[PDB]
Design a protein around this ligand. Structure first.
Ligand SMILES: [Ca+2]
Ligand SMILES: [Ca+2]
Ligand SMILES: [Ca+2]
Length: 176
């Protein structure tokens, strides 16, 4: 499916899957899918959430599997993928709107999915692309999705959590 991911990469989307897959059964319902988006601050109607989750569903079982969702990440973006998922994950994380996703905006966001990082963990997570600043702009914040530096098949999944939160969140702007 025009996908070029490795066995290890398949373990990535897994994390982006848990975002919704609560019981981790292998199918993200509309009630679970919209559970994230809305958790981010969105408010997608079950009507759309369907046409959305049905826009990827390879079986149209009104649910997203670990294969479909993973195939989505490699079937959503196109050219300026990052950028796309950036501006999205950017205007998504920045709740205050200062062009810099502060700790909260980050952690709080990570907590909107389940990830509860300590003010220290977040304040540290920023340093990643915050050069020990305190916030991340469309530039720094993007430096994350495009980090792959000090990850070693670990962080790539940490930031991947945003890849979905963004993409998935962006899917609602496309489903339209
Ligand atoms: Ca589920
Ligand atoms: Ca499915
Ligand atoms: Ca801000």
């Amino acid at each position: 499916g025009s996908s070029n991911l490795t066995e290890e990469q398949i373990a990535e989307f897994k994390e982006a899957f848990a975002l919704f897959d609560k019981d981790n059964n292998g199918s993200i319902s509309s009630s679970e899918l919209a559970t994230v988006m809305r958790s981010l601050g969105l408010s997608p109607s079950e009507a759309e959430v369907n046409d959305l989750m049905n826009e990827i569903d390879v079986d149209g079982n009104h649910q997203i599997e670990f294969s479909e969702f993973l195939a989505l990440m490699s079937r959503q973006l196109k050219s300026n993928d990052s950028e796309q998922e950036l501006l999205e994950a950017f205007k998504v994380f920045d709740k205050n709107g200062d062009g810099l996703i502060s700790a909260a905006e980050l952690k709080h966001v990570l907590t909107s999915i389940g990830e509860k990082l300590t003010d220290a963990e977040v304040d540290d997570m920023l340093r990643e692309v915050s050069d020990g600043s305190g916030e991340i702009n469309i530039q720094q914040f993007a430096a994350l999705l495009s980090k792959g530096s000090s990850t070693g098949t670990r962080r790539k999944a940490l930031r991947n959590k945003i890849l979905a939160i963004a993409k998935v969140s962006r899917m609602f702007s496309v489903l339209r």
